[PDB]
Amino acid sequence: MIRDIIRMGDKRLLRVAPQVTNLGSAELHALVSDMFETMGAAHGVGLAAPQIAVDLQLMVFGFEAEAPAVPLTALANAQIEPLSDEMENGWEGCLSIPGLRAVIPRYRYIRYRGFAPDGSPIEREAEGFHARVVQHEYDHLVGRLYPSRIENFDTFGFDDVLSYDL
Amino acid sequence: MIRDIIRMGDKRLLRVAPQVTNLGSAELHALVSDMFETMGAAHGVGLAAPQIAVDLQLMVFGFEAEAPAVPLTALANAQIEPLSDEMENGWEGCLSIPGLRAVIPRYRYIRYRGFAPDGSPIEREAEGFHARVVQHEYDHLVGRLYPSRIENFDTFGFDDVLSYDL
Numbered sequence A, B: 001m002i003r004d005i006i007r008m009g010d011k012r013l014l015r016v017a018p019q020v021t022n023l024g025s026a027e028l029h030a031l032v033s034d035m036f037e038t039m040g041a042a043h044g045v046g047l048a049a050p051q052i053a054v055d056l057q058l059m060v061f062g063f064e065a066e067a068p069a070v071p072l073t074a075l076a077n078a079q080i081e082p083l084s085d086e087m088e089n090g091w092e093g094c095l096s097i098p099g100l101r102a103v104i105p106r107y108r109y110i111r112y113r114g115f116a117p118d119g120s121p122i123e124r125e126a127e128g129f130h131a132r133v134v135q136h137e138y139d140h141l142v143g144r145l146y147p148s149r150i151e152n153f154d155t156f157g158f159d160d161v162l163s164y165d166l
């Protein structure tokens, strides 16, 4: 089922979410299925559970169709560790902040760990857009959105209007 | 005539505007008239010329109808000076950033100086919302918008969704 995505300004996006403790359950697999459905109907590349007012350390992300393909992934209890100090700027937008985007610095190289909805462990090294998406969704699980990370406010604006060439 | 208001992301909002040098002219009085018309149709309380892609140190502002009434004013070549170090937080939104608002600290007490469209000097002390509006519009004449002034990102969100009690 498609769930409503709450927008920036909702206090429910500013919470620190507790862990998932029902790995392997029918209830988790249903929530994850709704998340993938929801993300797809909104044409997102990532969606975290707090964005559908579900207070849990859970996100879905990934796509074929521009950057290189990111595998379709549902990840509970995510933990992230940079694998280098190197930062890279790139464009970010967010389904909870419709119409806008900005340039945001992220770590270029990370590892992330957690669990798939069936309880099996996930751990991967990621770089570039893949790594960016996982950092951006992880921020939602700690009550953070991308505007508080903008450094260059010239790059923040409506998608149909911006002409900034990063 | 009503003019289009350009939105955040337009480079034309990020310019430093030159002075008005046609005080008393028919062309200035027509531009000012369009600005008041434009501001009123959008229900604004302030509008600066860069917001209608006119690169000039010129703003209009003011209203009867909530804060205390601010006199309807057209002000060219504005210069602002704080009259105290005291800052105050308050809600700001912007016609070039439709749908959003945030809490922004401004100087509580200022003087501002410049010229009315007929060339006569204007100088006034202002406080509270009056002072805030003039500082906010003045920022447009130096290529600045309110997001680069937010300190507490919990307060930034869509007007129909926020429940932050300042």
Ligand SMILES: CNS(=O)(=O)Cc1ccc(Cl)cc1
Residues within 6 Å of the ligand: A045, A046, A047, A091, A092, A093, A094, A101, A132, A133, A134, A136, A137
């Ligand atoms: C999940 N969000 S994100 O910032 O990491 C990926 C993204 C990048 C650019 C745009 Cl316009 C939208 C989303």
Ligand SMILES: CNS(=O)(=O)Cc1ccc(Cl)cc1
Residues within 6 Å of the ligand: B045, B046, B047, B091, B092, B093, B094, B101, B132, B133, B134, B136, B137
């Ligand atoms: C001209 N802009 S402003 O921030 O100074 C006045 C204002 C205050 C609150 C809202 Cl929601 C909109 C405008």
Ligand code: NA
Residues within 6 Å of the ligand: A014, A015, A016, A142, A143
């Ligand atoms: Na928070």
Ligand code: NA
Residues within 6 Å of the ligand: A080, A081, A111, A112, A113
């Ligand atoms: Na690690």
Ligand code: NA
Residues within 6 Å of the ligand: B014, B015, B016, B142, B143
């Ligand atoms: Na600028």
Ligand code: NA
Residues within 6 Å of the ligand: B080, B081, B111, B112, B113
């Ligand atoms: Na002064």
